[PDB]
């Protein structure tokens, strides 16, 4: 039912080698979600690494901008649930077999035969990105995804091969922390990790820190851009720009709006292509 020429293949599954050899089939395995006969391709990424043939088909990868074999996004290198939780639009897809699954899957394959270049619904909302998901976007990822799965007979001590067993050895797995939408167990801990980062400890008073020491101005930040980026938060009382240290001083009437600026600018407010420097003001008349 499905033929292909080349799969999606994000970089963490290609391997460390730009020179890999790959064999192909015409009708290979079924997808583990919808059982569609795609074309499984097989290659060797590394010398200590398993083959990682193919998990899903091309069509289900073209719905949500997903790679081919490890089920992560191509645009970041993240799972699907983090992506549509950060963008707050799920682009729903059924769960059963013959109820509504293959119906809308065949129709979305039928309407996407022209382009084959972009996903069906994420083309308009993958543009307003790089704000909340750029904070965890791992460059040069760990190659432990590519290492082979654990073998038996070393857990029981029966392995006659010894060192020439190609899979792994001396790796005790843990039965406490290991599909398409939900639910994923370590991903909940990853959302707890991004919800429990390392900010500055909030001093115990009643919102008196309305000043803020922001610097790194140079020639990109100007006064009108900064006061219009503060104007969407609210109104000023006394603002200034100092150029001997390349810094700006802003305050607010009732602190809370600038408080989310404190949520916005903990090495996080990225305007004009620069990681700005932010530390605390005095708020003490010192």
């Amino acid at each position: 039912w499905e033929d292909a020429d080349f799969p999606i293949l994000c970089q963490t599954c290609l391997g460390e080698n730009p020179y890999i050899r790959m064999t192909k089939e015409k009708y290979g395995k079924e997808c583990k979600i919808c059982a569609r006969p795609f074309t499984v391709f097989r290659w060797c990424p590394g010398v200590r690494m398993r083959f990682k043939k193919t998990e899903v088909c091309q069509t289900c990868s073209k719905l949500k901008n997903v790679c081919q074999t490890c089920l992560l996004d191509l645009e970041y290198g993240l799972p699907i649930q983090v992506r549509d939780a950060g963008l707050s639009f799920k682009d729903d897809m059924p769960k059963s077999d013959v109820n509504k699954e293959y119906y809308t899957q065949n129709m979305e394959r039928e309407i996407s035969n022209s382009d084959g270049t972009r996903p069906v619904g994420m083309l308009g909302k993958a543009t307003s990105t790089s704000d909340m998901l750029l904070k965890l976007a791992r460059t040069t990822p760990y190659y432990k995804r590519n290492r082979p799965h654990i073998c038996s007979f070393w857990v029981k001590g029966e392995c006659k091969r010894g060192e020439e067993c190609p899979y792994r050895h001396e790796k005790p797995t843990d039965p406490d922390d290991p599909r398409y939408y939900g639910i994923n167990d370590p991903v909940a801990d990853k959302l707890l990790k991004r919800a429990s980062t390392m900010p500055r400890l909030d001093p115990p008073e009643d919102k008196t820190i309305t000043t803020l020491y922001v610097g790194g101005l140079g020639d990109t930040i100007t006064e009108t851009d900064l006061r219009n980026h503060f104007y969407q938060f609210g109104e000023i009382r006394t603002i200034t720009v100092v150029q001997r240290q390349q810094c700006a001083f802003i305050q607010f009437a009732t602190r809370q709006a600038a408080e989310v600026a404190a949520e916005k600018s903990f090495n996080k407010l990225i305007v004009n292509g620069r990681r700005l420097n932010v530390k605390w003001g005095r708020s003490q008349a010192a």
Binding site: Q11, L14, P18, K24, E25
Partner: protein, 195 residues
């Protein structure tokens, strides 16, 4: 026009306006827009259509009946695909990444692996063009009463309603009629025997 053209790649939904269902102006001998083209154009488009359906039916015969001794392929080709999604430090030096593509041999001792038994309802078809009939008329209150039907007074129905009113019982003229019921030549027989 895009309201009725939805999803299509610039098809012929330009019918959607009123101005192309009026009768076109009278043509008598206007050769370039009315006459057929030359033999060369119809022959070249016939050759294109013939080689298209010929390669289609050749793929069909080498797909429906492929059993008799076909070679697989000669997979000596490479493919070069630029990693233009992530690479700034991902696999440092990955700039266009040419790889090797061969084909696995399918042995001819295999049944069909995947159960081709799925049945789904037919999905949404091509989107409906505008309908653009003549202005719809309604006749009277009496001709609509003329174009109706009485209920069925059948003997065997095995259907909705056997439908007994007080009337509609004989369901005929009189169930038997001869238009004169007799001939007088009977008399020209009968008394002629009697005398």
């Amino acid at each position: 026009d895009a309201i009725a053209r939805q999803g299509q790649s610039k098809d012929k939904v330009i019918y959607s306006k009123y101005t192309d269902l009026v009768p076109k102006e009278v043509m008598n001998a206007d050769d370039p827009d009315l006459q057929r083209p030359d033999e060369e154009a119809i022959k070249e488009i016939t050759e294109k259509t013939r080689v298209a359906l010929e390669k289609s039916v050749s793929q069909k015969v080498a797909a429906a009946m492929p059993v008799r001794a076909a070679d697989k392929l000669a997979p000596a080709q490479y493919i070069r695909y630029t990693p233009s999604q992530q690479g700034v430090a991902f696999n440092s030096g990955a700039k266009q990444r040419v790889i090797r593509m061969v084909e696995m041999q399918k042995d001819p001792m295999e049944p069909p692996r995947f159960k081709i038994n799925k049945k789904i309802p037919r999905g949404p078809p091509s989107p409906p063009a505008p309908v653009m009939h003549s202005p719809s008329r309604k006749m009277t209150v009496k001709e609509q009463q003329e174009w109706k039907i009485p209920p069925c007074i059948s003997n065997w129905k095995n259907a909705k309603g056997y439908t007994i009113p007080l009337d509609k019982r004989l369901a005929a003229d009189g169930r038997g009629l001869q238009t004169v019921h007799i001939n007088e030549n009977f008399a020209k027989l009968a008394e002629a025997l009697y005398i």
